[PDB]
Design a protein around this ligand. Structure first.
Ligand SMILES: CC(=O)N[C@H]1[C@H](O[C@@H]2[C@@H](OC[C@H]3O[C@H](O)[C@@H](O)[C@@H](O[C@H]4O[C@H](CO)[C@@H](O)[C@H](O)[C@@H]4O[C@@H]4O[C@H](CO)[C@@H](O)[C@H](O)[C@H]4NC(C)=O)[C@@H]3O)O[C@H](CO)[C@@H](O)[C@@H]2O)O[C@H](CO)[C@@H](O)[C@@H]1O
Ligand SMILES: [Ca+2]
Ligand SMILES: [Ca+2]
Ligand SMILES: [Ca+2]
Lengths: 128, 130
């Protein structure tokens, strides 16, 4: 069971924003609704999110970043990016932007983009 | 830097928007996000005074970004800060009474009242002045 306007998928609820904001404000926006900028835990979830993103032609932020530009990607839950997910980057990605780097769903895979760019976002929280 | 969008009011470096439509608390939170704002999180007594005057003169019940949804009795602002002991004085007499389970805060008369989150109320957004 999920709140109205939230999507249920494999035990979790996902909120697809209908507006755009920078990565930081997106992290904040999800906490406002007792959720978290989506942290992908399984390949099934990734396929699901990538699909929703591509069908709506909307570049969307996920809770993954390398704010120090040290090439060290971490999820907002504190966990690191497993090498198993490195395959989700689009061709040539991730290419540092020269500024704080954040991950976005773009077409078929993920892109590295500047964190202050305005993108749609996706929040996630357990179903009830 | 005291510039605000049309229909928004300025006070101490921030812009406030009072809605003309009504939505439940949850939808109000997301409504403010759509306009690059946040359901009002009150940080100072002075701000509370400014807002209570605006709301009482409009004669409307309006949502603020405060709730005790996570833990009944412990109020939290949507920005992650807890309701301070000093701000508890703003609840109207006899409130919060959790009548039929009320976990969202609204401006009501001269102070605040907890109401059911699924109730349609006007709302107030806040964002930095530019
Ligand atoms: C006279 C005046 O100042 N008018 C102002 C007005 O002031 C407010 C107004 O409130 C009138 C009622 O408005 C709504 O109906 C409710 O907010 C109601 O409160 C009860 O119901 C809500 C749920 O709908 C509860 O959240 C609330 O706690 C309260 O519940 C009742 O609580 C008692 C005590 O525990 C309990 O015994 C009852 O069973 C319970 N009832 C229910 C339904 O649960 C308001 O009473 O007038 C009040 C004067 O007495 C003021 O105190 C209010 O602030 O504000 C507007 C806005 O500016 C202004 O235009 C108007 O002139
Ligand atoms: Ca409750
Ligand atoms: Ca309550
Ligand atoms: Ca009440």
């Amino acid at each position: 069971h999920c709140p109205k306007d939230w999507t249920f998928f494999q035990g979790n609820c996902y909120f697809m924003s209908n507006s755009q904001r920078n990565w930081h404000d997106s992290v904040t926006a999800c906490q406002e609704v007792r959720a978290q900028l989506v942290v992908i835990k399984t390949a099934e979830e990734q396929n699901f999110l990538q699909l929703q993103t591509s069908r709506s032609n909307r570049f969307s932020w996920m809770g993954l970043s390398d704010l120090n530009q040290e090439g060290t990607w971490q999820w907002v839950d504190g966990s690191p990016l497993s090498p198993s997910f490195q395959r989700y980057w689009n061709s040539g990605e991730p290419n540092n932007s020269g500024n704080e780097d954040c991950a976005e769903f773009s077409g078929s895979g993920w892109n590295d983009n500047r964190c202050d760019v305005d993108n749609y976002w996706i929040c996630k929280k357990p179903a009830a």
